[PDB]
Amino acid sequence: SKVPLNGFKELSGVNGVCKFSIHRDFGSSERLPSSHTCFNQLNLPPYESYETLRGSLLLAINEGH
Amino acid sequence: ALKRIHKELNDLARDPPAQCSAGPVGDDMFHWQATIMGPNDSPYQGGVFFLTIHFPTDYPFKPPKVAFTTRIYHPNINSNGSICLDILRSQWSPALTISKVLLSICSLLCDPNPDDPLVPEIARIYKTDREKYNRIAREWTQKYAM
Amino acid sequence: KTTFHPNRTSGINPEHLSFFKFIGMIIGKAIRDQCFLDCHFSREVYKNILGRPVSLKDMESLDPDYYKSLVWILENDITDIIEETFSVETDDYGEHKVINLIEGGKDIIVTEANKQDYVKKVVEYKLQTSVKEQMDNFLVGFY
Amino acid sequence: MQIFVKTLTGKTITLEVEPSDTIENVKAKIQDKEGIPPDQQRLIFAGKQLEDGRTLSDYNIQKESTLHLVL
Amino acid sequence: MQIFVKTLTGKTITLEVEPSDTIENVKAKIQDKEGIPPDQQRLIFAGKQLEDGRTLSDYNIQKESTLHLVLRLRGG
Numbered sequence: 001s002k003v004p005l006n007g008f009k010e011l012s013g014v015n016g017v018c019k020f021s022i023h024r025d026f027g028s029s030e031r032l033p034s035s036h037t038c039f040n041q042l043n044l045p046p047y048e049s050y051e052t053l054r055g056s057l058l059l060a061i062n063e064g065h
Numbered sequence: 066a067l068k069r070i071h072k073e074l075n076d077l078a079r080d081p082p083a084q085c086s087a088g089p090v091g092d093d094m095f096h097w098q099a100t101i102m103g104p105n106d107s108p109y110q111g112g113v114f115f116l117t118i119h120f121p122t123d124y125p126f127k128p129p130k131v132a133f134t135t136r137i138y139h140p141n142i143n144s145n146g147s148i149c150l151d152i153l154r155s156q157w158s159p160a161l162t163i164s165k166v167l168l169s170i171c172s173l174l175c176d177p178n179p180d181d182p183l184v185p186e187i188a189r190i191y192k193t194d195r196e197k198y199n200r201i202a203r204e205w206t207q208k209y210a211m
Numbered sequence: 212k213t214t215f216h217p218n219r220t221s222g223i224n225p226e227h228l229s230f231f232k233f234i235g236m237i238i239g240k241a242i243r244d245q246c247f248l249d250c251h252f253s254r255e256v257y258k259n260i261l262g263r264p265v266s267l268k269d270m271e272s273l274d275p276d277y278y279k280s281l282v283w284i285l286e287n288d289i290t291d292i293i294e295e296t297f298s299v300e301t302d303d304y305g306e307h308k309v310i311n312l313i314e315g316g317k318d319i320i321v322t323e324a325n326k327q328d329y330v331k332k333v334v335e336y337k338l339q340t341s342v343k344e345q346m347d348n349f350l351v352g353f354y
Numbered sequence: 355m356q357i358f359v360k361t362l363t364g365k366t367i368t369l370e371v372e373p374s375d376t377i378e379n380v381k382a383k384i385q386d387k388e389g390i391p392p393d394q395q396r397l398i399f400a401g402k403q404l405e406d407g408r409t410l411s412d413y414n415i416q417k418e419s420t421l422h423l424v425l
Numbered sequence: 426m427q428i429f430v431k432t433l434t435g436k437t438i439t440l441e442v443e444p445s446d447t448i449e450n451v452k453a454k455i456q457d458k459e460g461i462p463p464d465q466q467r468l469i470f471a472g473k474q475l476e477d478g479r480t481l482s483d484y485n486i487q488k489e490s491t492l493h494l495v496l497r498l499r500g501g
Contacts, residue, residue, distance in 0.1 A: 066293070066295075068293070068294050069292075069293055069294075123277055123280075125280070125292075125293070126276070126277045126280035126281070127276055127277055127280070128276065157276060157279070157280075158279075158280070158283055158287075159280050159283060159284065159290075159292060159293070160283075160288065160292065
């Protein structure tokens with residue numbers, strides 16, 4: 001939950017510096033967005049509506065904890 | 066910790082359960098190079114892939130770092146060579162050994178895991194476009210496995 | 212990377228105790244001044260400044276995976292897999308050194324009959340003894 | 355440990371102190387040994403004046419450290 | 426020949442030195458890259474502090490040698 005000292009340009013992963021990356025996912029739109037913390041990777045489905053995307057992201061982040 | 070690494074090297078050179086050949090390089094026991102043969106009944110068959118392993122100084126208390134030096138076409142393997150593997154990330158235990166992780170890598174190559182992909186494009190291609198996945202994997206193996 | 216813990220090798224600079232005390236007073240002033248600091252400290256520092264004893268739970272924050280291996284050694288099995296002894300090997304700026312957790316720690320071999328004390332000594336040395344003087348200066352500066 | 359205090363022309367005196375001891379305690383010990391009040395004592399180490407509110411470890415003062423007393 | 430200088434956790438840098446040059450030359454060459462003045466840089470090797478007057482030959486320095494860099498804690 002801590003941003004890098006310098007900022008988001010200092011994002012680091014297992015292999016070293018790695019900036020936040022968002023990758024399209026063609027799976028079923030009902031699929032909850034997935035993430036890989038080892039590379040700050042976020043696989044996101046192309047939600048048609050902003051409300052649906054917000055709900056899915058909220059569900060993902062809340063279920064993470 | 067060097068004794069554990071020596072034991073693992075002796076075991077690998079004695080009876081390596083996995084279809085692979087790995088050993089230290091540059092006179093350093095903490096840096097290793099490994100070769101994984103292409104499993105049969107798969108487009109990777111007939112191809113050998115090269116991997117680089119870095120052993121943490123706290124081994125076996127810390128998982129080894131594994132990267133795919135050889136370019137491969139796999140949903141769960143990054144193009145740059147990064148890998149996703151639970152046993153090396155959160156499930157690592159001191160009881161685990163280099164041979165065990167090599168066997169796990171060989172299996173993952175045998176059965177991909179589209180459910181947790183590092184490249185959604187390849188995952189979708191494999192799931193719904195098996196012919197394209199097989200063809201592209203064969204081409205990549207021919208180009209960068211031999 | 213965001214959070215830091217005091218460095219064992221701070222002894223290279225003779226003035227490190229005074230600088231730790233200065234860090235303590237500046238942190239105290241920041242708390243008084245209500246100026247938030249993006250810096251973070253390992254759980255050991257917070258527990259010690261609050262006076263609570265430090266245990267493997269603090270070790271979890273510093274070395275999550277390594278703490279997992281330690282707890283697995285202690286409880287999840289009977290270990291007896293590594294020939295580690297009651298000593299710690301370190302590389303201080305190219306100089307290889309060995310520090311004995313207990314008297315004669317180098318020779319005594321770690322076993323299931325002495326793992327419970329081995330892990331306790333390891334964590335105590337890592338968190339408290341290795342930083343005793345520096346953390347005491349930090350605490351007196353803060354208070 | 356012990357430290358030594360030397361004047362410009364006088365002899366050298368020995369004071370048993372600890373890192374937590376403040377320079378005020380050092381001046382008090384100097385007064386007890388010689389009678390000079392703290393206000394009349396100026397302490398220098400490594401060419402730097404020593405303040406009352408700080409301690410020995412602050413200025414990197416260790417065992418057998420030599421200080422200069424100026425009145 | 427070439428030598429390597431590394432910080433506690435930062436990157437590593439390479440200098441082009443020779444045995445005869447004093448540690449002053451090494452500190453100056455470090456300065457051109459990072460900018461730390463020589464008076465502030467503390468250079469260590471094999472766990473023993475170095476000195477400006479001596480040189481690489483005095484410290485039996487050789488090829489592909491790694492030194493450790495620290496920033497001075499001025500006392501006052």
